[PDB]
Copies of this chain bind each other. A is one copy, B any other.
Amino acid sequence: RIKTNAAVAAVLPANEDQADYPSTFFEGGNEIRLYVNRGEKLDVLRQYVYMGLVEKNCRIQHVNAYLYAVLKGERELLEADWDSFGHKIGIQGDKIGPFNLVRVEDIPDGLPDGKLNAEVSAEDDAWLPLFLLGLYRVGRASETAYRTLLMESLIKQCKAIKSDWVSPVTATHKYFDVWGNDGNYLKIVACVDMFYNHFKKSIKATFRWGTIVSRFKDCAALATLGHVVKITGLTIEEVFTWVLQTEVADELVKMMKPGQEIDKSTSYMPYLIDMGISAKSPYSTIKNPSFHFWGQLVAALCRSKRALNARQPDEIDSMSISNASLLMAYALGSSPDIEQQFSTGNTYRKPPKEASYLVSEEPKNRSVVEWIAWYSDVDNKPTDDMLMMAKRVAGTISGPRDNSVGKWIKQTYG
């Protein structure tokens, strides 16, 4: 602003972008528009899918037309009404099918260049769609040591008919992860995962291997909130209460938009990206950093092994968040939940209103106001008992990763 003499300064960095909620979609009653390639015999299409897959090149159009040709007609029961964002899916007591949420929308002239026909199988449907959908998940991986998903796939599909199977996919080739950029492939994989999540009693529900990574994709902050609610024993209101930063609170407020049907398991929200409803999800770690550092740091300091591998985001105010996380973890650990539950002929511990204990001035509950008063009494610095507890927690981490929460805990607190 104002310098020594009189000069005012225009203090300004560059701006940023935003994200789109699912409720903006379906405001004008839009549809999904899969743009299905179809109009051919299923048998020859399965031959185009088979041959070429033996060598090192397959076509996205071939597997697309196949998946619509084979997944159609697999109707199931419907014991209740299905609704999401006002879009009616099915009537109670009817047959539904996996491709009724999205209309077919026959594609314009973009028909693929087919090849010759191999020996006619007409029987490989027990493994071939499962193989393609699992190959999608294998292509979603990024570590060569994490290519045991392929070995799990071969273990799964080697017993497809009786015992015999030969793997046609190279363990090191990367010619199938390009298919993740195709919108129609994501739309069908989200369709089958959404439909077969509703009916887990079907025989064909084994196809959900590979398609599970479509559910809640780029929505890790909701899972972070659920994990920090369950791992501490607090209610959701208390978890929201114990937040002591304005950035984290603002991201929570932006994440709690009301009309997004957050709580409904049978809805369109967890398939936000692959359905094409939104391109920038407002529930990710990139959209909400430093709420992924909070919560995960709290759960790691509450001795949970999942949160020790969460990545620490860069370009966030780490030190104040670490102070708040240590305060909340120490407050949770100092005062546990030992309330008597069952009784035969006797009552509880009957506390006769102590309200004063100067051993460390610590309160006997998990209320945030008494704990923040006690923390401000000691000049907002970590007490020696807090650092001892943090060192004891950090001593139980064997090997941390490069940019993980566990590496931060081991480096910062001994």
Contacts and interface: CB of A to CB of B under 8 A. Distances in A.
What's the number of copies of this chain in the assembled complex?
A: 3
Contacts of A227: 315
**How many of chain A's residues touch chain B, expressed as a range?**
35 or more
A32 interface: no
A379 B364 contact: yes
Contacts of A122: none
Contact of A237 (B1, B248, B262): B1
Contacts of A149: none
A135 interface: no
- Most chain B beta carbons < 10 A, residue from A226, A265, A320: A320
B303 A1 contact: no
B2 A336 contact: no
A369 B342 contact: no
Interface of A is mostly: loop
A318 interface: yes
A275 interface: no
A126 interface: no
Interface string A243-267: 1111111001100101000111100
A314 B319 contact: no
Given A13-B229, A232-B317, A262-B14, A367 B339 contact: no
Interface stretch (A18-26, A37-45, A76-84, A345-353): A345-353
Given A315-B230, A376-B351, A396-B411, A263 B15 contact: yes
Contact of A359 (B10, B175, B359, B379): B379
A233 interface: yes
Nearest to A395: B411
- Most chain B beta carbons < 10 A, residue from A159, A230, A319, A324: A319
Nearest to A235: B11
B320 A349 contact: no
A240 B12 contact: no
Nearest to A155: B174
A346 to B, nearest CB: 5
B237 A11 contact: yes
A96 interface: no
Interface string A137-150: 00000000000000
Contact of A244 (B258, B341, B364): B341
A265 B14 contact: yes
A197 to B, nearest CB: 11
A376 B396 contact: no
A9 interface: yes
A236 B12 contact: yes
Given A2-B344, A349-B373, A362-B379, 11 more contacts: A3-B253, A3-B341, A9-B240, A10-B262, A11-B237, A12-B263, A230-B315, A244-B341, A245-B339, A303-B318, A324-B338
